[PDB]
Design an enzyme around this catalytic site. Structure first.
Site, PDB file in Angstrom:
ATOM      1  N   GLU A  11     -39.291 -25.515  53.537  1.00  0.00           N
ATOM      2  CA  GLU A  11     -38.635 -25.248  54.811  1.00  0.00           C
ATOM      3  C   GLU A  11     -39.175 -26.074  55.976  1.00  0.00           C
ATOM      4  O   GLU A  11     -38.476 -26.221  56.964  1.00  0.00           O
ATOM      5  CB  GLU A  11     -38.826 -23.758  55.161  1.00  0.00           C
ATOM      6  CG  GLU A  11     -38.102 -22.882  54.171  1.00  0.00           C
ATOM      7  CD  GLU A  11     -36.632 -23.026  54.295  1.00  0.00           C
ATOM      8  OE1 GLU A  11     -36.092 -23.630  55.206  1.00  0.00           O
ATOM      9  OE2 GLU A  11     -36.009 -22.302  53.447  1.00  0.00           O
ATOM     10  N   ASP A  20     -30.272 -26.024  61.038  1.00  0.00           N
ATOM     11  CA  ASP A  20     -30.661 -26.167  59.677  1.00  0.00           C
ATOM     12  C   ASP A  20     -29.684 -27.101  58.953  1.00  0.00           C
ATOM     13  O   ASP A  20     -28.805 -27.681  59.550  1.00  0.00           O
ATOM     14  CB  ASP A  20     -30.805 -24.827  58.992  1.00  0.00           C
ATOM     15  CG  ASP A  20     -29.486 -24.142  58.791  1.00  0.00           C
ATOM     16  OD1 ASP A  20     -28.422 -24.645  59.019  1.00  0.00           O
ATOM     17  OD2 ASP A  20     -29.597 -23.012  58.175  1.00  0.00           O
TER      18      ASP A  20
END
Ligand SMILES: [Cl-]
Ligand SMILES: [Cl-]
Length: 162
Positions: A11, A20
């Site tokens: 991540e 994202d």
């Protein structure tokens, strides 16, 4: 290696609001804030999450705090999920971390839809599961990360992360 290091690798860590891979506002270590298009809505969710007026920036500590909650929640989500729990219970420690990574990324719901893969994993048919897991949008959209998780299920080791 452990789940925390594993997800920290997948991540990353960002201290300012970001989009994202799906274009949603996120912050820290993969903490989704909102699927809405509005930066305000995101700043608003952020403040509510941290408990202070952040102005869209958080510290390392705050990021880690959200991360711990999110990991906890994923686990607890699996344990409460009738489709997921039994899979999780059947797995070894390494492979459980792979299942947690998936849930953290896609939500309990998302993962519970991989019906066929789930059954294969429960049955310990590793290569087959690996092949089935790859026939997914998840793999086609984030292939490098998906390959890492898939190798983890396949081998039961952390090799993909070293
Ligand atoms: Cl929250
Ligand atoms: Cl990827």
């Amino acid at each position: 290696m452990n789940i925390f290091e594993m997800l920290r690798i997948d991540e990353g860590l960002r201290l300012k609001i970001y989009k994202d891979t799906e274009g949603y506002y996120t912050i820290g270590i993969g903490h989704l804030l909102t699927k809405s298009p509005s930066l305000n809505a995101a700043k608003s969710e952020l403040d509510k999450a941290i408990g202070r007026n952040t102005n869209g920036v958080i510290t390392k500590d705050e990021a880690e705090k959200l991360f711990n909650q999110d990991v906890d929640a994923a686990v607890r989500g699996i344990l409460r999920n009738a489709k997921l729990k039994p899979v999780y219970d059947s797995l070894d420690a390494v492979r459980r971390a792979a299942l947690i990574n998936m849930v953290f990324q896609m939500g309990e719901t998302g993962v519970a839809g991989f019906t066929n893969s789930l059954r294969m994993m429960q049955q310990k048919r590793w290569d087959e599961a690996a092949v089935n897991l790859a026939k997914s949008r998840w793999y086609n959209q984030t292939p490098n990360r998906a390959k890492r998780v898939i190798t983890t299920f396949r081998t039961g080791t952390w090799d993909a992360y070293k």
